[PDB]
Design a protein around this ligand. Structure first.
Ligand SMILES: [Mn+2]
Ligand SMILES: [Mn+2]
Ligand SMILES: [Mn+2]
Lengths: 345, 347
């Protein structure tokens, strides 16, 4: 278990640090052989190096089996140009690992149905992993262009793009509740048939996971009326962008959400949440998304499923016992992380 | 006020009759000079003519100032060649009147928040109209195809396409709450920027209408967290499809939703629901969607906003006071329409 930790900026460190405190408490109980190192990335790297993703960190990432990253970015580094922006170093990190699937779970923890915009009866039990294809389709598709008379973008997909992103979904499914919904617009678009056919074909390799198909329009409906029946959702770039933003608001507290990016290189595990300098330092930031990222890490990077689950659970009971300020409660980073610990036995 | 009435299949004719009862009650109270003919269309046309959209219906539609339409389709017809399919008829109707805008409002009636998938606080007051471009975008774009190695599709919009759908949204906002949110994907896509520039440019002619832009993915988060803050919403074919289908489930009863298609010729108004051949002629079909379509017809076809609001309010009280069986009630078709009429008695 060798991890590269890039804490980044603002609440970046505090939370990421909270998550290592969990990781250290786990390696100690379970005997993981956890061996991590901290590398400068983003604002921190720009200040010390002049670039947000300098060579000593690119190297540190490759030599690790997982990347635990906190958030990057700040108002200090905004009066800066393209080439060296923390947002750009973030795009370089992903590109250097060839991360092609964004995995983002939107779970409703028991006792937290009150936070959901959905009625308690609907928000109860929701735990859906949205797997979004990150490098193809309309966003990178070509031909593309603009003129006084018209504009055009091209939703293009190739067979391997659909394939690898499909395997990611199946691998994940096997780990949770064993079901894959693939989403497309096959009843009108050729890309959809292409998509669906290709997925079905990857399915022949996984007779173990059930496979359902839905049109992006229908899925936007199912995700509001019955999100609780979905396990794993796989789809293209734009639809994945939409569907995962849709799914992200079902737990009704965005600062709680973890995120991963799988690919050919070192996977990356990060909180979906921003840097938040407003509260950076202060020991109040909610370390939940980070501890959960670390948990997605153990699961997607090192396959310790059962273990990622005790982490998640430990976080669930913590959210309920002594809630962080964003949940109306009054527990800070040190207070909360100590709670997650007591419940990790 | 000349209306061509296409009852269609299943419940279409029963719920269309109900809507006419409201129209007749109003013609009477206010002399609208209402006049209407009924024409065959959908399955009922295929049965008597061999095609879903026959010449006299085609001609009738061409002459009327609005079309009131029921639902079309059903088991008896679901496998035919495309040339004589109900869907094709429906598609022939819109093409013959060059209808490019699909209007689909999603209103949560006061007191029916309990139907909403959302918590009450969030559902209260939801009343959003989604204006979906319908003849362009990716669904019809060139180029297109699939090999065994790659497939392609193009999200294409020309300036006049985006202009005309904006105008509709703007005029529609003038009768509502004077706020339009134009939805694109301007931060990653060329089509997005084009769409924004174009819409913004058009907005210069509706300076009385508050305008706002949203990315499609942020809009999907907004429609769940605060759909109550939007009035009219305008976007392209695919996003519209996704955003209206998303809006569509907010109120919790799909059978109540009306629909309108606007363009160059005769706008057409219809329920969103299917023909439900199941409960056809049992006296139970909920005529709400059909009554609300008649209301949309009073508003986008005839400019009778005030009148359209009285139909909606009457309908609203009917839904709390005597709900149909799909709302847990027992008020069959005739009984519900009579409640709406009896409420419109407070003229
Ligand atoms: Mn070293
Ligand atoms: Mn997004
Ligand atoms: Mn649809």
């Amino acid at each position: 278990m060798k991890v590269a930790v890039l804490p980044g900026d603002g609440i970046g460190p505090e939370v990421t640090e909270a998550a290592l405190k969990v990781l250290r408490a786990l390696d100690e109980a379970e005997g993981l052989g956890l061996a991590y190192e901290v590398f400068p990335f983003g604002g921190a790297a720009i200040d010390a190096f002049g670039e947000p993703f300098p060579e000593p960190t690119r190297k540190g990432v490759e030599e690790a089996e997982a990347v635990l990253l906190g958030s990057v970015g700040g108002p200090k580094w905004d009066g800066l140009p393209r080439k060296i922006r923390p947002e750009t170093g973030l795009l370089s990190l992903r590109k250097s690992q060839d991360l092609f699937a964004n995995l983002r779970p939107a779970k409703v923890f028991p006792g937290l149905e009150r936070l959901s915009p959905l009625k308690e009866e609907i928000a109860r039990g929701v735990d859906v992993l949205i797997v979004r294809e990150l490098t193809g389709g309309i966003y990178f598709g070509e031909p593309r262009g603009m003129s006084e008379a018209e504009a055009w973008n091209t939703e293009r997909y190739s067979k391997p793009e659909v394939e690898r992103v499909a395997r990611v979904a199946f691998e994940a499914a096997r780990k949770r509740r064993k079901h894959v919904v693939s989403v497309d617009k096959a009843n009108v678009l050729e890309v959809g048939e292409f998509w669906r056919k290709t997925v079905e074909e990857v399915g022949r390799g996984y007779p173990d996971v059930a496979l359902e198909h839905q049109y992006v329009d229908a899925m936007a409906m199912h995700l509001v009326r019955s999100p609780a029946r979905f396990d794993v959702v796989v789809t293209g770039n734009i639809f994945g962008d939409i569907l995962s933003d849709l799914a992200s608001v079902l737990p009704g507290s965005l600062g709680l959400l973890p995120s991963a990016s799988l690919g050919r290189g070192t996977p990356v595990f990060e909180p979906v949440h921003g840097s938040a300098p407003d509260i950076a330092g202060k020991g109040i930031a909610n370390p939940t998304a980070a501890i959960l990222s670390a948990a997605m890490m153990l699961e997607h990077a090192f396959g310790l499923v059962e273990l990622a689950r005790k982490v998640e659970d430990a976080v669930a009971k913590a959210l309920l016992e002594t809630p962080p300020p964003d949940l109306g409660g009054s527990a800070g980073t040190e207070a909360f992380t100590a709670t997650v610990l007591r419940h990790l036995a």
